[PDB]
């Protein structure tokens, strides 16, 4: 699971075939001040030119001079086109024009300047005659500056040349073959027994990235062998050249899913360190020594531009996305989809074992046959499932059978991380009357009969009930058993039980699978609670009741909460062990907390995932006719949330007469939610509302 | 004829998931007229 | 049938009819989805009367507009069954997988569930889960497929007012 | 429509005849491993032979004999960890192909004590409920 | 105004919705059951296995009642009751081709259909009839008959010891004769968990050509710091409302209203009136129970005032209904609000026409079933009870294999015709009519 | 009344587009049928006959069917039947019921109101 899903993530984000495609139907850098040449006679060359204007950031390129009188015989010429690749007040901007036809002997003037900057003159005197098409090799190897073709890598390109310089989209080619060689080959050196060679390794866990020596010493080795491939594919560039490639991450998808079925549960979380340590080869190292080699030296309308500032902007987003869904994905789904909920099975047997959860016995004075009913299984258990540690029963003042001398004093000092979960009579907590360690095989089979002699018991206004823990080691997971008796005053008892599987991984000395994305989701809570403070801090005030900030700052409250119980988990589990293995044979305090705050992180990064995918149907109005269906909805909903209003009015006294006859939120829960199951006819009325809107909407498209 | 099949399956934890299949099969095709018919009904499907 | 006659013979050995009773199941399943696609193929054929007409036109319409809110439907479908199955899938027999996690959100829809299983394995996020379960289709999700199939039918209609009244 | 009043009334026979006269549970509701065994010998034996050969509900024809078959788990099949070594003694496996029993154990005499593989055994896989058996 | 002198409609309204739920306390479910639990629950030994709801013979009747009612003499007051119904021998007729199937015919529990019929041991008042001056009675109509009030009520003593002695009587002067037609008893306990009033009334029918078919009644009344300071409040503020609204008779359209969604609070007001009038005979009853604790010899007759205390806290909830819509009718303050009573009050000229010919084909498909399937199934055995057999079809609630089994070829073609018309013509014109009139609202909204 | 022949010409003037969509109706409703019957008529009780595979797919839309023997009978076809079953019936082919009846009672009532227009 965590070998596939960071492969189809990574195969999902080529969806930026419809960004990019989108991208390639297209295809104050320059002053707007008029440019006239008064010197050179006899030498109007009916030619183009070409801006060599490179600088900060910025590699803007050559002009095509279009003439409506051609730019005739002894004149000049002033225009203005929309360069997008924009300079500031930098010392390097140039022009070159040709020699067609005769060679000009023209000393090309000057080209005035306005809004050089924003609204600055510069007086530009360039008044030398050149070459053919030389430059202005001058202010605001030979040609030493040239490696300025810092966008011929694939690290970072969304920017090329227009109308020239192939492979725009076809670079969102290399990238696809490029994460998954890295994907596929760092699975290979990872366990894929074969019958290598002379030494190469076995298993070859060794501590993953808790010590930086091999997870990362694997990064710098695993890009030499796909690079003397996949540079290949900058070749092609001068079809079904271009098919093969996505047929080799056709076939890197398949053997790097096969060999990692049998991955140990280091090994998965060594594989994403040894792979996203070997991307940052290619980017960091690779692709900035690869634009060193190429090409070293050869001396041997006005609106569209603003369009794609919106269409880098929603790319970048996306870069964000399908990498913060790729660790929440990994968090809850990743590991409770083999261990965790495959095996309710482990909770399926203890409801049907203590004979059918003890028939559900309600009673005071009873159970003493049924103690007789779960010691007798749960003392030497010849079958299966093992005891870890010995069980107890705690006891909610008022000690009988006194001699309270020195005995007398069952304690329970109740010290503890928090007050355990509630039932009918109140919020109990870890400090009852504990007693009754029962233990050794047959005293315990003989205390039942000492709790009749001594009585313990009808004091205290309430009373308490017995623990147990216990686990499987075929699945890798525990249990934490409590059952309930409630001694209600009015009623004989009220038995209720809970049984709760986990996983016990605490510390793993130091690096675990949800010790890393823990530390990624704190991150991106660290990542948005800063974008959150360029808007409110700056940009605007009396932000009130816009669920824009009112709703990216619950994300932010629900992504922070839910690393600080994942690390509450680990740091709860390791100091439970701790003092569990102390004492190894001898207590029973241990596992009822870590069970109950390990659902309340996984039951909390699925919300999360929730709202991540609610999120991505939210981001489909980008078809322009499946446009109507988000704003048709987020329009009727001001007034159809309106129209319930009147219904708890009126369906609150249909209840009022219903279940207020019931002799002739816990029941109004049962009566406004177990209402719209089966009555149907007012289920109907938001039917008028969607389509008055979506014939408005779609009369006004 | 009849070809039962009664899966007993225990589990890590160890309970007990059953499981059952009864499935009756004609092998004896060529008997009646009523299958000759359904034999010469074969064909025809093939032909379409 | 070499297996059968290979025991018609020997009347005190084990008959293996297990390999030749699993291409029953798939003989059954391939020669009634056949069946089904069928009686689907009526329709290319039935488009006889005036009154006919006006239903194929609407339904084929239509299904541009109906399947781009029947992936907007299902994202919101498959993410209540993300919730169920992590916060009663320990409980409850009928989010016991998340195969069977969405089959039983199909039941409450017709019914079906009481629910005194849900509220008693979660007090608090349980019946939240179930009264934005039933707002969400039932006021909102299944009444934005009505509104589809509305204006379309009455987009037809009005259309061939336009060629009756056009015409005569 | 001769076909379903001959597999229901097959269904009624060993899946809600009791186990036993005295007990209640059916095929359907085996909950434990004891259980198992008082099936085998309990409605096995009264659903199958009916007295020559066997004709069940006096019209059917048992062809042959039947046979029962297992799949089992090595012993040292899974890791436990060392802090809990002491009262855990062995261990045993969910059940995967590479964690599958093969050595002959107990009274080694017959055919049931041997491990056979699946092509010696004119056997094929079968999807269960938990797994996929070979 | 329309907040200050109109605040009494949205301002005490609250009190009615909170001292309703405040006062109602467990004691009339609770205790209801916690009384219920031991005189129809405990069968006679381990012998008899068939209680109270599985009764059929004559002295089988006689082995059922006869051990829960001697624990049953919590702590009760009054004394025992053994009744039944008399009916003549020669009351109906039969044929004289052949007569020697026949000797005697008679018509079933009845006002003049049955007799008195005094026969041999005439000692005492149990097999000697008399009339309804001595006890209280009325004529009462179950599922069987509309009976009398009439007969004998051949009591015992409060102890268990007489109640088993005059249980020696039964074999002989039974409480089963040739034309034994019922079989009731009377009971009230004074209960010491929950200080309250209670009832009973255990009755087993007899149909001929067989047995019986048992049914139970009693109901919970309890006795009674906010104890009793909900009585002032709950007519006080309807006080100046009888003054008022009578007092709007001098005013509005000349005394000439007609309007529905303000003359639901007048009507209901009424149904105030219903409460308001009551407490002059019936609430202030206590020559009813002032006999009751004092004499501890003489029989329990608050059983009969347990009669017209059925309608007293099932029509004192009627006054729930009404007051919430009308609350919602000067309730709708907003914008949003006004929108959605001008539909449901615009609608409802067109809506209860649509309602008429709605219940014509479904009181026709209740002829069908009456007279098809009312022979064969429980479901379809009365009338009344065949229509409330038609809305368990449309929530679901109906397996129907009784329905085929009953009748193979005319069974299914009710049932799917049923389906057919409620469900995609009959339910989705109800839809098309609210939906053209919300749809109508809006949009003249729109042009305002 | 007024608004009885409102009501009557209403469900008149539907009755021929209203039988021609019953027919596409059952020709789906009849294509389940035959599903139904060929996967599951040896297992379930509730798919015995034809003529009872009919009367247990209403008993669908009421509600009424566990499907705990049809999950059981079949586990890969059965619910791509129990699920496919309820999508199109309740998303599409009981709301184009409510669409036809929905366009025709709107479509009287317009036309009295060049009625009642042309009166005065």
């Not at chain 3, 029947?70 to 997988?97: E, K």
Request: proline share 3%; aromatic share 14%.
């Amino acid at each position: 699971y965590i070998v596939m899903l960071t492969c189809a993530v990574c195969l999902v984000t080529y969806m930026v075939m419809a960004a990019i495609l989108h991208k390639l139907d297209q295809l104050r850098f320059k002053y707007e001040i008029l440019v006239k040449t008064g010197w050179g006679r006899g030498s109007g060359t009916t030619a183009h030119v070409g801006i060599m204007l490179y600088g900060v950031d910025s590699r803007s390129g050559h002009r095509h001079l279009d003439g409506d009188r051609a730019f005739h015989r002894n004149s000049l010429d002033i225009f203005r086109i929309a360069t997008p690749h924009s300079l500031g007040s930098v010392w390097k901007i140039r022009v070159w024009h040709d020699n067609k036809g005769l060679s000009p002997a023209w000393f090309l003037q000057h080209v005035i300047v306005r809004d050089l900057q924003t609204a600055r003159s510069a007086f530009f005197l360039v008044n030398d005659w050149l070459s053919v098409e030389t430059e202005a090799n001058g202010g605001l190897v030979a040609e030493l500056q040239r490696g300025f073709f810092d966008k011929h890598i694939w690290l970072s390109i969304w920017d090329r040349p227009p109308r020239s310089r192939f492979t725009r989209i076809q670079r969102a080619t290399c990238c696809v073959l490029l994460i998954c060689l890295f994907l596929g080959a760092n699975a290979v050196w990872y366990g894929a027994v074969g019958d290598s060679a002379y030494s190469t390794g076995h298993v070859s866990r060794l501590s993953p990235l808790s010590v930086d020596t091999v997870a990362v010493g694997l990064v710098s080795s695993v890009v030499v062998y796909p690079v003397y491939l996949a540079i290949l594919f900058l070749f092609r560039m001068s079809s079904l050249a271009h098919g093969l490639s996505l047929l080799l991450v056709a076939v890197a998808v398949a053997v790097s899913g096969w060999v990692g079925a049998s991955f140990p549960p280091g090994v998965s979380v060594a594989w994403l360190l040894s792979s996203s340590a070997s991307f940052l080869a290619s980017f960091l190292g690779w692709e900035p020594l690869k634009v060193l080699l190429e090409a070293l030296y050869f001396s041997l309308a006005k609106e569209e531009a603003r369009k794609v500032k919106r269409l880098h902007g929603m790319l970048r987003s996306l870069l964000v996305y399908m990498l913060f869904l790729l660790v929440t994905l990994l968090a809850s789904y990743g590991d409770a989809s083999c261990h965790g909920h495959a095996y309710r099975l482990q909770s399926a047997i203890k409801q049907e074992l203590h004979s059918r959860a003890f028939l559900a016995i309600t009673r005071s004075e009873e159970l003493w046959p049924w103690m007789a009913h779960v010691l007798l299984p749960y003392v030497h258990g010849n079958q299966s499932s093992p005891e870890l540690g010995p069980p107890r029963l705690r006891q909610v003042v008022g000690w009988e059978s006194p001699h309270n001398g020195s005995g007398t004093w069952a304690y329970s000092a109740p010290d503890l991380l928090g007050a355990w979960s509630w039932g009918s009579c109140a919020v109990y907590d870890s400090g009852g009357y504990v007693q009754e360690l029962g233990l050794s095989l047959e005293e315990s089979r003989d205390r039942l009969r000492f709790l009749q002699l001594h009585n313990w018991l009808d004091n205290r206004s309430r009373a308490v009930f017995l623990e147990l823990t216990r686990y499987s080691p075929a699945v890798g997971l525990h249990a934490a058993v409590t059952l309930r008796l409630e001694f209600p005053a009015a009623g004989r008892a009220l038995a209720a039980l809970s049984v709760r599987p986990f996983a016990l991984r605490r510390l793993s000395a130091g690096l675990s699978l949800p010790l890393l994305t823990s530390v990624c989701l704190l991150l991106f809570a660290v990542h948005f609670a800063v974008a959150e403070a360029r808007t409110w801090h700056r940009e605007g005030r009396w932000r009130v009741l816009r669920l824009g900030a009112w709703a990216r700052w619950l994300l932010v409250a629900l992504t922070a909460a839910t690393a600080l119980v994942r690390l509450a988990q680990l740091g709860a589990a390791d100091r439970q062990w701790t003092r569990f293995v102390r004492g190894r044979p001898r207590r029973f305090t241990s596992f009822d907390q870590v069970a109950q705050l390990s659902s309340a992180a996984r039951g909390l990064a699925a919300s999360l995932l929730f709202l991540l995918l609610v999120k991505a149907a939210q981001q489909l109005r980008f078809v322009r006719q499946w446009s109507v269906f988000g704003k048709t909805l987020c329009r009727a909903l001001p007034e159809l949330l309106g129209v319930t209003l009147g219904l708890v009015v009126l369906g609150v006294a249909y209840a009022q007469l219903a279940i207020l006859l019931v002799s002739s939120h816990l029941s109004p829960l049962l009566c406004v939610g177990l209402w719209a199951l089966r009555l149907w006819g007012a289920l109907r009325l938001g039917a008028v509302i969607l389509r008055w809107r979506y014939h408005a909407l779609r009369g006004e498209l | 004829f009849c070809v039962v099949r009664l899966l007993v399956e225990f589990p890590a934890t160890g309970g007990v998931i059953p499981s059952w299949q009864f499935q009756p099969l004609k092998l004896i095709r060529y008997v009646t007229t009523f299958d000759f018919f359904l034999a010469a009904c074969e064909i025809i499907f093939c032909f379409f | 049938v070499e297996v059968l006659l290979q025991f018609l013979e020997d009347q005190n050995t084990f008959p293996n009819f297990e390999h030749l009773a699993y291409w029953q199941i798939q003989f059954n399943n391939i020669a009634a989805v056949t069946v089904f696609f069928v009686w689907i193929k009526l329709f290319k054929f039935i488009n006889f009367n005036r009154t006919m007409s006006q239903l194929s036109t609407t339904m084929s319409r239509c299904a541009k507009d109906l399947f781009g809110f029947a992936i907007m439907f299902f994202i919101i479908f498959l993410a209540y069954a993300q919730l169920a199955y992590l916060v009663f899938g320990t409980q409850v027999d009928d989010f016991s997988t998340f195969q069977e996690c969405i089959f039983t959100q199909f039941r409450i829809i017709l019914g079906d569930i009481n629910f005194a299983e849900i509220e008693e394995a979660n007090r608090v996020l349980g019946p939240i889960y179930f009264t934005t379960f039933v707002f969400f289709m039932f006021f909102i999700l299944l009444n934005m497929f009505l509104a589809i199939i509305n204006d379309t039918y009455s987009e037809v209609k009005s259309d061939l007012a336009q060629q009756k009244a056009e015409m005569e | 429509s001769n076909v379903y009043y001959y597999t229901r009334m097959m269904s009624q026979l060993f899946l809600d005849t009791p186990v036993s006269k005295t007990e209640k549970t059916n095929f359907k509701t085996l909950s434990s491993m004891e259980d198992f065994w008082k099936f085998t010998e309990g409605s096995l034996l009264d659903g199958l032979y009916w007295k020559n050969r066997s004709f069940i509900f006096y019209e059917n024809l048992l062809l042959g004999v039947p046979r029962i078959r297992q799949l089992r788990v090595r012993n040292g099949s899974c890791s436990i960890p060392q802090d809990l070594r002491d009262e855990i003694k062995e261990c045993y496996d969910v059940y995967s192909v590479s964690s599958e029993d093969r050595a002959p154990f107990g009274p080694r005499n017959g055919t049931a004590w041997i491990y056979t593989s699946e092509k010696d055994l004119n056997g094929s896989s079968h999807w269960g409920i938990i797994a996929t058996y070979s | 105004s329309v907040l200050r002198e109109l605040v009494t409609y949205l301002l005490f309204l609250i009190v009615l919705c909170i001292l309703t739920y405040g006062m109602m306390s467990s004691n009339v479910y609770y205790y209801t059951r916690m009384m219920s639990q031991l005189f129809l629950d405990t069968p006679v030994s381990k012998t008899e296995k068939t209680n109270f709801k599985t009764l059929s013979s004559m002295e089988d009747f006689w082995k059922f009642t006869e051990g829960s009612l001697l624990d049953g003499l919590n702590l009760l007051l009054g004394v025992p009751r053994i009744r039944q119904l008399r009916v003549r021998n020669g009351s109906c007729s039969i044929p004289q081709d052949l007569r020697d199937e026949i000797k005697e015919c008679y018509d079933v529990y009845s006002v003049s259909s049955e007799d008195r019929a005094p026969f041999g041991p005439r000692n005492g008042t149990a097999w000697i009839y008399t009339s309804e001056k001595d006890l209280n009675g009325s004529s009462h109509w179950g599922i069987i008959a509309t009976y009398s009030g009439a007969g004998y009520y051949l009591d015992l003593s409060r102890t268990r010891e007489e109640t088993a002695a005059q249980v020696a009587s039964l074999k002989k002067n039974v409480w089963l004769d040739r034309g034994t037609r019922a079989t009731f008893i009377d009971f009230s306990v004074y209960n010491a968990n929950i200080n309250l009033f209670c009832v009973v009334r255990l009755l087993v029918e007899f149909p001929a050509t067989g047995g019986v078919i048992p049914s139970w009644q009693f109901q919970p009344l309890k006795l009674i710091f906010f104890l009793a300071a909900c009585e002032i409040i709950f007519c006080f503020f309807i006080f100046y409302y009888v003054v008022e609204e009578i007092l709007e008779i001098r005013i509005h359209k000349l005394h000439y209203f007609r309007s529905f969604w303000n003359c639901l609070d007048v009507v209901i007001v009424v149904l105030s009136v219903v409460a308001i009038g009551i407490n002059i005979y019936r609430t202030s009853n206590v020559e009813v129970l002032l006999q009751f604790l004092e004499d501890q010899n003489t029989f329990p007759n608050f059983e009969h005032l347990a009669y017209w205390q059925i309608q007293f806290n099932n029509i004192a909830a009627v006054t729930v209904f009404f007051v919430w819509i009308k609350l919602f009718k000067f309730i709708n303050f907003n914008r949003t609000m006004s929108q959605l009573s001008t539909t449901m009050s615009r609608c409802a000229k067109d809506l209860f026409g649509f309602a008429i010919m709605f219940f014509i084909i479904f009181l026709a498909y209740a002829q069908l079933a009456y007279l098809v399937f009312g022979t064969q199934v429980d479901d379809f055995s009365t009338f009344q009870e065949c229509i409330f057999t038609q809305f368990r079809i449309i929530l679901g609630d109906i397996n129907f294999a009784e329905i085929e089994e009953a009748n193979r070829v005319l069974g299914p073609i009710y049932f799917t015709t049923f389906v057919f018309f409620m469900f995609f013509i009959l339910l989705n014109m109800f839809l098309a009519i609210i939906n053209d009139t919300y749809s109508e609202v809006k949009s003249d909204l729109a042009q305002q």
